[PDB]
Amino acid sequence: STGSATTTPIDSLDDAYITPVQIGTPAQTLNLDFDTGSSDLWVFSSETTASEVXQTIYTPSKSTTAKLLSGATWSISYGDGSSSSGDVYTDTVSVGGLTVTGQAVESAKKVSSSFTEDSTIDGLLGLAFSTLNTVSPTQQKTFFDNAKASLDSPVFTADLGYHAPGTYNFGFIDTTAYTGSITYTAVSTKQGFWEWTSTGYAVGSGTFKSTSIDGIADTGTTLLYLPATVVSAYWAQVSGAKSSSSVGGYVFPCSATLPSFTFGVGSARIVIPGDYIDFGPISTGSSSCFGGIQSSAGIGINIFGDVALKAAFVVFNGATTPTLGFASK
Ligand SMILES: CC[C@H](C)CNC(=O)CP(=O)(O)[C@H](CC(C)C)NC(=O)[C@H](Cc1c[nH]c[nH+]1)NC(=O)[C@H](Cc1ccccc1)NC(=O)OC(C)(C)C
Numbered sequence: 026s027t028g029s030a031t032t033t034p035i036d037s038l039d040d041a042y043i044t045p046v047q048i049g050t051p052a053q054t055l056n057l058d059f060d061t062g063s064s065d066l067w068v069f070s071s072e073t074t075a076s077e078v079x080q081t082i083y084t085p086s087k088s089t090t091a092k093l094l095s096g097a098t099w100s101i102s103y104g105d106g107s108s109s110s111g112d113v114y115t116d117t118v119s120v121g122g123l124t125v126t127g128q129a130v131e132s133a134k135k136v137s138s139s140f141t142e143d144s145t146i147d148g149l150l151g152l153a154f155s156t157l158n159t160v161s162p163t164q165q166k167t168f169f170d171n172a173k174a175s176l177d178s179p180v181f182t183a184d185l186g187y188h189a190p191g192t193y194n195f196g197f198i199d200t201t202a203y204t205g206s207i208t209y210t211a212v213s214t215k216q217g218f219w220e221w222t223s224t225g226y227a228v229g230s231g232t233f234k235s236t237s238i239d240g241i242a243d244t245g246t247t248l249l250y251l252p253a254t255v256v257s258a259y260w261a262q263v264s265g266a267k268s269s270s271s272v273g274g275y276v277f278p279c280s281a282t283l284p285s286f287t288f289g290v291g292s293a294r295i296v297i298p299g300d301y302i303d304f305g306p307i308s309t310g311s312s313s314c315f316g317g318i319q320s321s322a323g324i325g326i327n328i329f330g331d332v333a334l335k336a337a338f339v340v341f342n343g344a345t346t347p348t349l350g351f352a353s354k
Pocket residue numbers: 040041058060062063064101102103104105106107143146157158243244245246247248324328
């Protein structure tokens with residue numbers, strides 16, 4: 026079997042992307058944030074504290090196929106300080122025509138203020154390795170792990186758009202969605218992420234520096250976070266750019282024509298256009314814009330988030346020894 030679903034930006038800045046998911050019998054359709062940096066499928070529900078709901082909710086008592094997982098609870102927090110917690114059902118879950126039976130669906134009893142405040146996101150669908158799942162006492166498998174037995178190939182692909190709709194595919198590689206060939210690179214699962222080592226970088230039309238950069242492929246993070254010396258070399262080529270203590274990163278004039286940024290995948294090269302690195306104005310009508318490349322010093326890990334991934338066709342190969350592929354598009 027295979028599945029194919031459309032993913033859409035939530036707002037005019039590409040802050041995040043939503044994808045429809047069918048849960049239960051008859052199907053209840055929710056719009057979820059597909060996140061390769063975490064491993065929980067959790068939803069707003071009929072159980073969520075009513076003052077913390079502003080979203081479409083899942084009602085397990087209206088689904089003939091829902092089963093309570095007795096004794097099981099969950100609790101998660103993210104790098105931006107957001108959090109949620111609750112109890113666990115198993116139910117039928119479909120994405121893009123691909124159906125999985127027995128999937129763990131984590132029903133929120135409570136959500137943090139940043140989730141209440143975002144009307145467009147009805148929950149998360151995690152796609153990192155199942156060792157990061159927060160269900161206790163026994164961790165639960167991701168939607169991808171449960172689908173692998175039936176899929177035509179144990180793979181999924183991410184094709185995110187720049188201010189435009191895109192695609193998540195399960196079980197096949199669409200050879201019409203990219204240019205050139207895919208280059209594959211080794212993955213370490215020791216921290217539970219799609220973790221890999223880039224071979225180096227170049228700024229604009231300058232020289233490629235061979236310096237190893239260990240980082241993660243993370244569809245749930247908006248920006249590209251890289252070492253302080255690398256980020257300083259990029260903004261040195263932008264004449265109005267400066268670090269702002271009060272705004273929280275590099276800022277520059279919205280009228281600038283920014284240089285591209287190239288990262289290495291083995292011997293291959295992925296080019297992020299300069300326009301993708303202009304995140305947008307600090308407020309509507311400002312002359313100052315926030316940068317899409319920022320230092321990873323305060324995070325402690327390098328993160329290839331949406332600014333980087335939307336410049337590529339990305340293959341998440343979930344064979345027993347996993348690998349990560351990148352192609353130009
Ligand atoms: C088991 C626990 C895991 C290890 C947790 N994993 C993570 O925290 C990484 P993530 O990609 O799953 C997680 C998902 C979010 C939906 C909360 N992302 C994050 O926590 C990162 C911050 C981060 C990452 N790493 C360190 N800090 N947040 C972000 O990047 C949010 C995303 C967002 C925007 C709009 C609406 C919803 C969500 N954007 C954001 O803060 O953007 C600006 C910097 C421009 C203001």
